[PDB]
Every structure is written in C-alpha cells, then in structure tokens.
C-alpha cells in the first residue's frame, strides 16, 4: 500500500509525512544538491548491491552475499576465510580485490527534455531504445570533457516520461576488511530463506581507497583510505517496536503500474514457471534418503485512472490499456518460451555460464604468450562459474537432468536451443544428453579442470560439450529477445502513455517511480505481524533463538563454540537489549527488493541502526503491489554486527574506528 | 510447579489462594459433604473419561473420543453418525447405549484406619494389595447392606498413607444425544495432536436416565431423564487472558513423588521405549509416497526432604530412598521387557486385542443355542477390536511387521512370548510370522470375518493365528507382572515410607496426592505462552484459523461446506468474541492428564466455560513435575460448542434446554 521507493529529489514532498512518523532529520540532511547529505554515504556495491560508509576512513558495510566473491577468491585451504571468516587488524592486512567497483552518486540532474530531443534524432528506431539504460547513458557526453573515475548513468523513469542522470564516482580499489564465519554470516540460509523470524549475522566489511587527493583510482601501492563527504554514524542504543525506520539503497525492479492483464500474464507465465522450476529443485533435493487478489487491486487502480481519463476528455489512457492487453496476448508464446529458458536453464542449471574460449585460443594458439593469456581467460571464467554463494544445493548432474527433461517437455524440439534439440536427438533423451556432457567436459569438476590445464589442447577447449551448451542457450536467449521485440515495443510505448496519465492524475511530486537500480529512499516502522491465527511474530530476534535452532548435524544450523560460550557467560557488553538479551535481527514495514541487499537502515536522527539483507516474502509479487500488513524487510541488528566484531572476533580496531554512539 | 490435583476435601485449604486469583465461589459451592455442590455435577464417563451435567434433565457433556464407541456402534452406511454427526430432536430420538456406565460421587469418606487394620489381617501378603484398588474395594462391605446401583470404590492415596472411599451412583442407561461431524470433532486430529494452537470442536453429548424416582437403573422403556442434585450452568459471555479457570475431573496417574533415580529409570526405560516404538510408526507412515532437567528438579525435592529428615533424627526417609534405588536396578531387565511388550505389542499392534473363543465355543459346540451365544461373543469382541478411534493410522500388516521385528531384536528368543518365539522359529522372521497371521486369520478383515461367520467351524476359531497371538502376548504380560513383583513390592513399601516423610514435613492439608482416577480439582489461569524466540501464542483460537488450515485433500483438514458458509456470512450470533471473531479453543495453565478428557472448565463463579480435551505436551513427563511456564491444557470453547448446536446443526432443542447465560 505505502511502499513507495521515492526519488532523492522527492525528499521535499515526503519530509512532512516522515516527521509525523517520528523523524527528526531535515530534508537537506537526507538529500542536498548543494552540500553533503546521506546520499554521499549510500553506495552501490558491485553493481547489484548496496553499501554504507560508516567512517572518515571510508569503512564500508554490506551483506555477506555481496562480498562473497571477494571472500571466496581470497580463501584457501590454509586460510579458509569463507568458513572461518576474515579479520584484518591493520590497514595493510586489508585484501585487494581486482575488478570490484563501488559507485557514489556525485550529483543528480533532470535531463528529460534533453534525452527526449535526442530520441527524435533516431532515423528508424527499434522502439526500445528509450528504455535501454545502455543507450541512454551514451547520450551523456553530448549533455555534459569527461573526467576519469567518473561514469554518467542515464535511465528511464515512469516508463520513459522522465529521464534523470546520475554522476557516479567509480572506485576501483575496494578492499576486504572483515567477514564473519559462514555459520554466522548465513545461519539457517536454506530453511530461513525469505523467512521471519531470522537469526542471521548477514554482513561483510570493505573499505574504499583513493589517491592522495581522494579521487577514485585503480589499485596502487600508494593508495590511501577514502575520506567521504559524509558517513553514517552507528547507533548502539537499540530499537523499539514502532520506531521510525529509514532505508536508502538501490532497489532493482518493481512493477507498480501493471495493468490488470499484465498481472494475469505475470501470474500465469512468469510466476508459475518460476514456482514450477523451483519445485523440481526441491524434488531433486528430496531424493536425499538419510482477502483481495493482486489482479483485483491493480484493476481498481486501473479503473481509477480510466474513470479520471473519462470525465476529462482524455482517450489515450483507455487506448493504452487495450494496446497493452493486445501486446500481452501477442507475445504469449514468446514470453512463455523466454521464461522456461530463464527459469529452467539460465538459472537452475549452472552449465549456462560455462567458460568460452576467446579468439586467442581459436586463433594464435601457436603464439605461446598469447596461448597462456587465453588459458588465463579460461581459468578466470571457471573460478567465476564453478560454485557460487547461494545456489549450489546438491548434485549438479542430477539437477540439470531433471530441469532439462522438464524443459524439453514444455518446449517442442524446433523451438529448443540448437545444442539441446541436437543433443536430445543424438543421445535420445535430455537425461542422456546431460550425462554425456558431465562425462566429457573439462569443467565438470575442479580436479578435471586442473588435470586438463596441465596439458591443454586447442581442440577440446573449442568443442567442449558444456561450453557449446552455454553458447547455444545464450544464442536462443537473444533470438527470443529480437523476436519478442515486435510485441515489447508496442507494449513499452503503451506503458509510457498509461503512466503519463497516472502522472497527470496524481502529479509527479506525489508519485514514486518504479525501481530501476538507482538511488532511492523509503520509510516505515519497526513492527512485527500476525502470520496465522493465535500466532504473533515480534519485531526483534535474540541470540537465544540461535541456540534454539542449534543442530550440530544440520550444517546450516551449526553454532560456533565461541558464540555459544559468549551466550552462556552473557558477555554482551553495551550491545545487549535493555532486557538483557543479545539482539540479532529485526524486521520493518519498509518496502525493499532485489538490489536493496546491504542497504543501511537508519534512525529518526539518521544514525545507522542496521543493515537490510532480506525480506519475508519471495517472488516479485510484492513489487507489483506492496502489502505492509504482513510483508516485511528483514534487517541485521547493528548491535549484533558490533558484537561479532568485538566479543566474538576480538578485532578492537574496527570498533575504535566505527565509534558506536552509546 | 503449581499443578496440584487437590482432593475435594482440601477445598478449605485452597479456597483462600483461589479467591486471590479471582474466584468468587465459596468452598461449599465446590465441595459440600452435607449438601449439593459442583461435585454432584462432575461425572466419570466410561470409567476413563470425565463428563459434566448441564441441565435439570441430566444432559451430559464430554469429548468426541469418550463417546466414540457409542457413535460408532450406532453408525451405518445409510446413517453415518461417525462422519456426518448425530442430532436428536427429541427425547425419544436419543440412542440407547448397552454397557455404557456413568458414575456420580455420592459421598466421600476417610477410611484410612479401617483399611490399614484390614491389611494387618492378611496372613502372608504379596506386598502389593495395599495399593490394589480391586482388593481395597472388596473391603467396603465390611465398612458400610449394599443397595443396587451403587459401587463402593476404595483407593490408596499418598502411596498408601491414606485411604478414601468413594460411594458411586452407577447409571447404566446413558443415551447418545448429539455429536458433531468428524471434520469438526477431530479437525487436525493427527497433525495438531498434543499441540497448541488448536481448532478442534472436540465434544459429544449424552444424557443420564433413571427410574421414576431418579435412581440408577438398567435400560427400560419407562426410564425418564435423570434430574441431578446440581448441574453446571453454561456461560456464553466469553473468556479473557488472565481469567481464573477451575477444572474438575478424574485425572488418571501422576508421579510427583518420584525419586531422582526413579526419573532416570523412567527416562532410560519407560520414555525412551515409548518414543522408539512411536518412531517406527511414523517411519511406516513415511513410506507413503504420494534450563533445569527433570531429574535435577526431583533430586532437589528429594534432598529437601532428606535434609528435613536429618536435623530431626529421622532415618527412615533416607532408608527409603536407597531402598527405592535398590528396587529400581533390580527390576531393570524386567521393567525393560515389560515396556517393550507394552509399547511395542500391547499398544501399537491391534492384534493384541483379537477375539478369544469362550467355553461355549470349545465346549458345547453341539448345543445349537449355546453355539450362537459363543459366536455372538466372538462378534462382540470383533466389533470392539477392529477399528478404534484414534490409533488406526495406516496399513496394519506392515505396521505389525515393523514393530514385531524391532521387538524381536530388543528381546531375546527365550524371553519372548511363546507365540512369537515359536512363530519366528518356524517361519524364519518376525515379518514372515505376521504375514502368515494376516494370511490365515478370520479377523484380518471385516469381509473375511463375515465370510467366515456364514459357515463357522469350531476348529478355526480355536486355532486362529491372531487369537493365539493375543493370548500368548497377554500371558507373557502376566508372567512379567508376577515376576517383577519381587522388586515392585519392596519399591511400593519404600515409596510409602518416603511419601510419609513428605507428609510429615509439608502436612496433608497442604499436599496434593498423586492422581488415581478419582475426583479432584485443579486451577490456574487462561494464558498463552512463548514456544520459541520471536513467537508468541495467544490464549484463544478463532474460526478463521480453521479456514487457514483448510485442505480439501488433507482429510484431517476438511472443512464442512456449512461451516464455511457460516464463516463467510459471519452468522455467529451472541456466541462470537467481542472483536467479532468466532471462538473455537483456548488454553490454560491448569494441570490435566489422561482421564481429564471431557473435564468441565468453569468460571470464577463456577459456570461452565469450556471442555478440556487435550494438553500441549505428550508423554508423562509433565506428570512427574508440572511446568506451567509452557505446559497448557487445551480446552474447547463452550461458545463454539453452542455455535455448532445452533448455527451449524439447527438443533434448537438443546439450546433451549441448556439455556446459555448471555
Ligand atoms: Ca533496546
Ligand atoms: Ca470475549
Ligand atoms: Cl541471435
Ligand atoms: Cl539472548
Ligand atoms: Cl502366568
Ligand atoms: Cl473468526
């Protein structure tokens, strides 16, 4: 209901409501176009996550998943940071992360008229370039002489009725500072996933580095900690039910302007196929041995705008709705095939991201120095392919067999990827085809890969079954996109017309746009809920809950001996709740989605109160229409984070830098 | 902690505490030795259950399980009362139940000195007759000229330190008045068993009949409704958290005076074997395809009495404790074999209660009229054997195989029942032995039994495999009892000595005796609890909870169309809670156990507020030491009972008789 993800510019038209909920911040304290504000502290981590700066030395807080790749890359047999955690006791002990990028919003500019004028310049348009962030960002040099360490991001808002430009400081020297052990960072990661109550210490600590002047730069020996314009201060006094909660971050995608028919499609195609493919997964895992509906809500909002379009002489609103419905039915087959490919293969079967040999392998194999460069690319691709964070569940060969068999049944042979339809044809079934791949591929195992990398050959790399699988699957993805574009372009144009009417009716200052992975703020209150009859969920969880879930045999519920020793002695310090319990997590009515992972949660005074890392609902259903009655965002208590650093890790250096207030 | 099951005579020494909890009743209103009180309204149903009289025409309320046998006996294909429920719209439509007995306490008398003097009369005693209720009840005619329709019950209290006599009016014309459908009477009977929250309408309605003068009698055409001295009035104003709750009934067995070593034995033998055998059951069901410990608490109480025995010159207390421990270890093997036979075969394998041919079958088969009499006994035994209420779960042949196989592994051949050790020896395994029985037995199926009963033969009945099984299993039971008696008698004597010391220390007026299936009262408050971190259970459940658990495919969760129609229209009447929700169940901190099934739950003013039908904990662990912090008794809301009669059934006759106050 009230889950708006507001633009930073809309702080003025929201500040009144927020102060009545208990906020003591001023509008300029949250966003200031002429000074420092909380904007300069909320960063984009690795492009898909969110982080917060908490010191004058550029200390960065985020989730455990967002920094997983970095923790994994730095992990070994002797020093398993992924399992045991990592704690640097000095600036020099902080681990360098090649490739890792963190962006800070320097300033935001309205370029609506500029972008629109640039779109008219196109001779014969595809019809989707007015929404493509890649195309829109290329129009930036003509608008702004582009400095280094700066990126100019331009994206569509309100379905293409507005265009805002984001000037980004791009830091390319982001180093790993700290990380909790896996038993804490993802306690009950499988069972309690997308679920409240929760008892997970989901965090990881990084730091921004720059030159002597504080400007973004590549890794250098001489680089020093970045000193931000503004960092969020950490509060350790605690939280209470009913408290105001401010969340800033980069929400990925929402669908708040969905026509009733768009909800039907999402339910019948997008959502059903997601649940169907996910069901096969937990079936493969299972062969272990020892009052108002969504469509009704969006239909009411649809009719509300249509009744406003009528009564006023506007016909376009009503033309847009039917134009949308027309495109929906037209792409029914295309959308269905895209979703099965996306839910069944691209996600679910890791083989889709198998390494591909570059031109240096096929060509120039005889050039020794160039050969090793191509082999290095292969090795690099394999490490970023083999075992990701949360996604490896069970036996990969059996999982791929079950998913591909279902895919082959849902999609006819002539509409399958070439590798799949040819493989099934030659080996008989989708099972036998997968079996062959895991039988012959280099990348089927680490020991297989390393055994091959000790005497490589060009042929073998070029004709690898798993590589051909990933390429042909990707090729189909892009064939579908080009073909469904004949329906998506009329859909997009009609959507722009429909949102334009909603904009005319409700006014832009009072209408939050859909999330598009740009900086936004949202607010609510710390509050529990009633999941079912007789049962009430509180807003806060404690360390006692961790001990209740302790199962020495269930690896997701393993409790570290040190953590258990702290619980027995009640050695919590000033981090504990007033009632003497040690806080772990809390939930809030604030709307967050994919991309808000690692978002700072702040006080009524704008002090860091926790880190967002999950929500109690899964699927995108809550992004179509938020339901604050039961839908919550699950947040790591910042006192628990401090507790892990202090009483568990013994890394006093980080406490002294953070300086938690009380 | 405070789960005393007080004698009716102890009402004086408890009334003060109860009134401070909010009770407005006087002591004489609960128990009066010279007048009518709530005592005369709380009846013993079928010997093992409890019932309450709620009208001047002898209307009786109890659970759905307590009257199951009656509902089943009266059920047929055309009129399935077990599934669809039963509702009599007049006195003449009430169904006669042969054999059903209901006892009312006429008066209670202290006969301690009399019984003890009678025990000294025994020449050479076994050592257990001072606890045997059968023996003690035979001493009654010498104490009291015994009228008809009266039974004199004498039992041991405080381990044989007190003896109280109960004069019982025995009604043998108890007729079935009403019963809810199975979908209501046992909604979620499997999953929500021994569990809170709960949404079960567990009840059944009977009525006492008597002669023209109101005296107990066998069934007769001329019998009229019994008019009790005192009946409990039904209150429909509702309940609130914190309200005083009085429960009267007949609790079966508790073990509050257990020595620390007695707790160890119970845990290692009694409880472990119960859980072990129960585990095999849910394993057979699973091959469906598509801060202080108990011993520590009782040790503290043990030492508390021992420290009191010392300091005072008493040595017997300390002699008793070691005497108990001596008997415990002595019967270790005997107790273990008794428990495996009890948990593995007597309960779990229904074959243990297979029909046995009487002397009229073996002898006098040539006498035609006597032959049919024996066949009638066989038929009677089969109906009371074949499919009980809550116990038939799944395939019986596979269940017996799994349990007997485990039994055979735990108990060596020479210590097994003769039928089992000889069957296993001839057929090879416990599986093949069970297979033979279900292959050849008459009683293996209803259709098998009826097919046999159309042309019976003497041999076949006499040598039936299932009959021989039940007899030899029973024979072993009685061989074990006679043999373990050499340890149980010194144990009993030592227990009597130990409780005697506790009696001397705490005083009888302030000490509640262990339950022995006699009339007792207990009290507490209506109150929820915290099962785990972040989760809170309320004290009351609503009809909304039923609809949330609705699963048309899960038979235990089938919701009747009529009940669902009532929920949609909110047709609750004055039965609904103040907030507009329809109450179903509530829980209280009152200690109840097996035998309290159907016990009346009453107001602070002694008005019927609900019926007890379960508790949120299983096993006997709470009967050794009650833990009111989380242990609750689960109670049917009386307003829900009235609602089922009125708005669901349409049996207005019962409402007009009950006359619910407000
Ligand atoms: Ca607090
Ligand atoms: Ca009420
Ligand atoms: Cl293509
Ligand atoms: Cl705690
Ligand atoms: Cl015997
Ligand atoms: Cl309700």
Q: Which residues contact B105 (CB under 8 A, 6 or more apart)?
A: B8, B39, B40, B42, B166, B167, B168, B519
Any idea which residue has 């966003």 for tokens?
Answer: A31
Residues β-bridged to residue B169: B104, B150
Burial class, A34, CB count within 10 angstroms (exposed 0-12 / middle 13-18 / buried 19+)? exposed
Task: For residue B634, report the distance from its CA to the centre of ligand 6, in Å.
Answer: 18
Tokens in use for B26?
Answer: 């006087």
Q: Looking at residue B253, what DSSP letter applies?
A: B
**Ligand number nearest to the C-alpha of A574:** 1
Q: How many CB atoms lie within 10 A of CB B399?
A: 22
Please answer yes or no on whether A535 and B535 come within 8 Å at the CB atom. yes
- Alpha-carbon B605 to chain mean position: 27
Please give the order of strands across the beta sheet that includes B535-537. Answer: A529-532, A535-537, B535-537, B529-532
- Contact at 8 Å (CB) between B631 and B615? yes
Choose among A35, A168, A44, A150: nearest CA to A106. Answer: A168
The whole-angstrom distance between B630's CA and the closest CA on chain A is: 15
Please give the order of strands across the beta sheet that includes A633-637. Answer: A6-7, A520-525, A244-249, A600-602, A608-615, A633-637, A583-588, A540-542
Cα–Cα distance for residue pair B265/B269, rounded to 1 Å: 6
Q: What is the 3-state secondary structure (H, E, C) of A16-33?
A: HHHHHCCCCCCHHHHCCC
- Contact at 8 Å (CB) between B581 and B570? no
Distance between first and last Cα of chain B: 36
- Contact at 8 Å (CB) between B40 and B28? no
Cα–Cα distance for residue pair B247/B264, rounded to 1 Å: 31
Cα–Cα distance for residue pair B109/B105, rounded to 1 Å: 11
Choose among A161, A198, A266: nearest CA to A528. Answer: A198
Choose among A293, A292, A291, A295: nearest CA to A255. Answer: A295
Buried b (16+ CB within 10 A) or exposed e, A458-489: eeebeebbbbbbbbbbbebbeebeeebbebbb
Please answer yes or no on whether B536 and A536 come within 8 Å at the CB atom. yes
Q: What is the DSSP string of B290-309?
A: ----HHHHHHHHHHHHHHHH
Helix locations, A260-293, DSSP H: 260-265, 272-286
Distance between first and last Cα of chain A: 36
Tokens in use for B53?
Answer: 């009289």
In this structure, the dihedral spanned by the alpha carbons of residues B90, B93, B98 and B102, taken in order and rounded to 10 degrees, is -20
Measured between CB atoms, does B200 come within 8 Å of chain A? Answer: no
The whole-angstrom distance between A600's CA and the closest CA on chain B is: 23
Cα–Cα distance for residue pair A76/A61, rounded to 1 Å: 24
Q: How many CB pairs under 8 A join A and B?
A: 52
In this structure, the dihedral spanned by the alpha carbons of residues B627, B628, B634 and B640, taken in order and rounded to 10 degrees, is 180
Cα–Cα distance for residue pair A624/A1, rounded to 1 Å: 10
Measured between CB atoms, does B495 come within 8 Å of chain A? Answer: no
Tokens in use for A414?
Answer: 């002539």
Cα–Cα distance for residue pair B46/B394, rounded to 1 Å: 27
Within 8 A of A540 by CB-CB distance, chain B residues are 534
Q: What is the 3-state secondary structure (H, E, C) of B535-578?
A: EEECCEEEHHHHHHCCCCCCHHHCCCHHHHHHHHHCCCHHHCCC
Rg of chain A over CA atoms, in angstroms? Answer: 26
Task: For residue B43, report the distance from its CA to the centre of ligand 2, in Å.
Answer: 28
> Rounded to whole angstroms, what are the CA distances from A562 to A153, A184, A443, A553, A558?
46, 11, 38, 18, 12
- Alpha-carbon B198 to chain mean position: 19
Which phi and psi (to 5°) does residue B437 adopt? -60, -50
Which of helix, strand or coil describes residue A293? coil
The CA-based diameter of chain B, rounded to the nearest angstrom, is 77
| Element at A323 (helix H, strand E) | helix A316-330
Q: Looking at residue B195, what DSSP letter applies?
A: -
Tokens in use for A317?
Answer: 């609103």
Cα–Cα distance for residue pair B355/B378, rounded to 1 Å: 6
Any idea which residue has 């035994």 for tokens?
Answer: B381
**Ligand number nearest to the C-alpha of B479:** 5
> Rounded to whole angstroms, what are the CA distances from B52 to B67, B152, B234, B639?
13, 21, 11, 16
The CA-based diameter of chain A, rounded to the nearest angstrom, is 77
Tokens in use for A631?
Answer: 């839908």
Tokens in use for A629?
Answer: 């009655």
Residues β-bridged to residue A600: A611
Helix locations, A6-132, DSSP H: 15-20, 27-30, 68-73, 81-84, 112-119
Tokens in use for A296?
Answer: 């009704």
Minimum Cα–Cα distance from A528: chain B residue:
B534
Tokens in use for B42?
Answer: 């709380």
Segments making up each domain of chain B, as ranges: 1-252+510-662, 253-509
Of B199, B533, B545, the CB nearest to A197: B533
Tokens in use for B526?
Answer: 């209506």
Helix locations, B85-155, DSSP H: 112-119, 133-137, 140-143
Cα–Cα distance for residue pair A136/A112, rounded to 1 Å: 11
- Peptide bond preceding B197 in cis form (omega within 30 of 0): yes
- Which of B236-240's residues contact partners 24+ apart within 8 Å by CB, and which partners? B236/B574, B236/B575, B236/B638, B236/B639, B236/B642, B236/B660, B236/B661, B236/B662, B237/B661, B237/B662, B238/B577, B238/B578, B238/B583, B238/B639, B239/B526, B239/B539, B239/B540, B239/B583, B239/B586, B239/B609, B239/B610, B239/B637, B240/B526
Cα–Cα distance for residue pair A420/A465, rounded to 1 Å: 11
Within 8 A of A196 by CB-CB distance, chain B residues are 534
Helix locations, B428-553, DSSP H: 430-440, 446-452, 458-461, 465-506, 543-548
Within 8 A of B199 by CB-CB distance, chain A residues are 533
Q: What is the DSSP string of A332-360?
A: HHHHHHHHHHIIIIITT-GGGG-----HH
Of A534, A540, A548, the CB nearest to B197: A534
**Which residues, numbered 526 to 585 in chain A, qualify as contacts with chain B under a Cβ-Cβ cut-off of 8 Å?**
528, 532-538, 540-542, 544-545, 548
Cα–Cα distance for residue pair A374/B583, rounded to 1 Å: 72
Tokens in use for B365?
Answer: 């088969």
Cα–Cα distance for residue pair A596/A593, rounded to 1 Å: 6
Tokens in use for B474?
Answer: 């029973």
Q: Which residues contact A318 (CB under 8 A, 6 or more apart)?
A: A306, A309, A310
Cα–Cα distance for residue pair B273/B412, rounded to 1 Å: 16
**Which residues, numbered 502 to 531 in chain A, qualify as contacts with chain B under a Cβ-Cβ cut-off of 8 Å?**
528
Cα–Cα distance for residue pair B571/B582, rounded to 1 Å: 9
- Contact at 8 Å (CB) between B106 and B167? yes
Q: Which residues contact B519 (CB under 8 A, 6 or more apart)?
A: B8, B39, B42, B44, B105, B108, B166, B248, B249, B250
Any idea which residue has 């329709």 for tokens?
Answer: B149
Helix locations, A582-637, DSSP H: 621-624
Tokens in use for B318?
Answer: 């300390």
Beta strands in B372-425 (DSSP E): none
Within 8 A of A528 by CB-CB distance, chain B residues are 534
Cα–Cα distance for residue pair A341/A270, rounded to 1 Å: 11
Please answer yes or no on whether A536 and B532 come within 8 Å at the CB atom. no
Measured between CB atoms, does A289 come within 8 Å of chain B? Answer: no
- Contact at 8 Å (CB) between A218 and A564? no
**Taken in order A158, A161, A166, A172, is the CA torsion positive or negative?**
positive
The whole-angstrom distance between B488's CA and the closest CA on chain A is: 40
Tokens in use for B177?
Answer: 């008045």
Cα–Cα distance for residue pair A422/A196, rounded to 1 Å: 46
Cα–Cα distance for residue pair A153/B363, rounded to 1 Å: 102
Residues β-bridged to residue A62: A204
Rg of chain B over CA atoms, in angstroms? Answer: 26
Q: Which residues contact B456 (CB under 8 A, 6 or more apart)?
A: B375
Q: What is the 3-state secondary structure (H, E, C) of B645-662?
A: HHHHHCCHHHHHHHCCEC
Counting runs of H as helices and runs of E as strands, what totals does chain B give? 26, 20
Cα–Cα distance for residue pair A70/A81, rounded to 1 Å: 10
Q: What is the DSSP string of B15-35?
A: HHHHHHTT----HHHH--TTS
Cα–Cα distance for residue pair A170/B336, rounded to 1 Å: 73
Cα–Cα distance for residue pair B339/A589, rounded to 1 Å: 54
Which of helix, strand or coil describes residue A613? strand
- Contact at 8 Å (CB) between B204 and B100? no
Choose among A87, A89, A98: nearest CA to A179. Answer: A87
Which of helix, strand or coil describes residue B419? helix
Burial class, B603, CB count within 10 angstroms (exposed 0-12 / middle 13-18 / buried 19+)? buried
Angle (nearest 5°) at CA A47 between A41 and A51 = 30
Cα–Cα distance for residue pair B207/A635, rounded to 1 Å: 59
- Alpha-carbon A6 to chain mean position: 18
| Element at B260 (helix H, strand E) | helix B260-265
Minimum Cα–Cα distance from A544: chain B residue:
B533
Q: Which residues contact A445 (CB under 8 A, 6 or more apart)?
A: none
């Amino acid at each position: 209901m009230d889950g708006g993800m507001w633009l930073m510019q809309q702080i003025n038209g929201q500040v009144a409501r927020m102060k009545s909920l208990g906020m003591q911040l001023e509008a300029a304290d949250i966003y200031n176009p002429n000074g420092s504000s909380l904007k300069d502290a909320v960063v984009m981590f690795d492009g898909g996550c969110t982080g917060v700066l908490v010191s004058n030395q550029g200390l960065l807080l985020t989730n455990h998943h967002c920094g997983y790749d970095q923790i994994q890359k730095h992990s070994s047999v002797q020093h398993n940071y992924l399992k045991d955690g990592f704690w640097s006791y000095s600036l020099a002990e902080e681990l360098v992360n090649p490739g890792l990028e963190v962006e800070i919003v320097d300033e935001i500019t309205d370029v609506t008229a500029a972008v629109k004028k640039e779109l008219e310049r196109i001779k014969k348009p595809s019809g989707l370039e007015f929404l493509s962030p890649r195309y829109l960002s290329s129009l930036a040099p003509e608008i702004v002489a582009s400095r280094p360490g700066y990126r100019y991001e331009i994206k569509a808002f309100y379905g293409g009725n507005r265009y805002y430009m984001f000037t980004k400081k791009v830091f390319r020297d982001v180093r790993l500072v700290a990380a909790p052990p896996s038993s804490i960072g993802k306690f009950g990661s499988d069972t309690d996933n997308w679920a409240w109550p929760r008892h997970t210490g989901d965090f990881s600590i990084f730091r921004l580095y720059a030159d002597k002047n504080g400007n973004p730069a590549e890794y250098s020996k001489d680089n020093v900690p970045y000193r931000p314009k503004r960092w969020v201060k950490v509060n350790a006094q605690g939280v209470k039910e009913g408290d105001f909660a401010l969340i800033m971050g980069y929400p990925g995608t929402t669908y708040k302007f969905f026509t009733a028919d768009e909800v039907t499609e999402w339910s019948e195609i997008d959502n059903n196929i997601r649940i169907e493919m996910r069901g096969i997964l937990q079936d493969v895992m299972l062969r272990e041995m020892l009052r108002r509906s969504l469509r009704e809500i969006k239909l009411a909002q649809q009719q509300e705008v249509l009744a406003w379009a009528k009564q006023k002489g506007i016909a376009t609103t009503e033309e847009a709705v039917r134009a949308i419905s027309k495109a929906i039915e037209g792409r029914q087959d295309l959308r269905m095939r895209q979703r099965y490919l996306l839910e069944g293969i691209l996600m679910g079967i890791e083989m889709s991201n198998a390494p591909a040999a570059d031109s240096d392998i096929a060509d120039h194999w005889d050039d020794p120095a160039r050969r090793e460069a191509g082999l290095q690319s292969i090795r690099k691709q394999f490490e970023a392919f083999f075992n990701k964070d949360y996604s490896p569940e069970v036996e990969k060969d059996q999982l791929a067999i079950a998913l591909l068999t279902r895919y082959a049944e849902r999609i006819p042979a002539e509409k399958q990827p070439i590798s799949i339809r040819e493989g099934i044809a030659e080996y008989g079934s989708a099972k036998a085809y997968v079996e062959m791949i895991f039988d012959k591929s280099i990348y089927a195992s680490r020991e297989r890969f390393e055994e091959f990398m000790k005497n490589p050959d060009r042929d073998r790399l070029l004709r690898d079954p798993m590589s051909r699988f990933a390429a042909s699957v990707a090729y189909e993805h892009q064939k579908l996109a080009k073909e469904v574009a004949a329906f998506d372009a009329p859909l997009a144009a009609a959507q722009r017309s429909y949102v334009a009417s909603v904009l005319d009716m409700k006014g832009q200052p009072n209408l939050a746009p859909d999330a598009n992975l740009t900086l936004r703020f949202t607010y609510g209150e710390i509050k529990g809920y009633q999941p079912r009859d007789v049962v009430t969920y509180g807003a806060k969880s404690t360390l006692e809950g961790v001990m209740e879930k302790e199962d020495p045999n269930n690896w997701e519920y393993v409790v570290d001996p040190k953590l258990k020793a702290l619980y027995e002695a009640k050695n919590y310090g000033r981090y504990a709740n007033s009632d003497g319990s040690m806080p772990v997590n809390f939930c809030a009515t604030t709307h967050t989605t994919g991309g808000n992972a690692g978002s700072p949660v702040m006080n009524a005074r704008g002090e860091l109160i926790g880190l967002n890392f999950d929500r109690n609902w899964e699927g995108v259903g809550g992004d179509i229409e938020y339901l604050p009655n039961y839908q919550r965002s699950i947040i790591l208590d910042i006192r628990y984070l401090l507790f892990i650093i202090d009483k568990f890790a013994g890394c006093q250096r980080l406490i002294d830098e953070i300086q938690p207030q009380f």
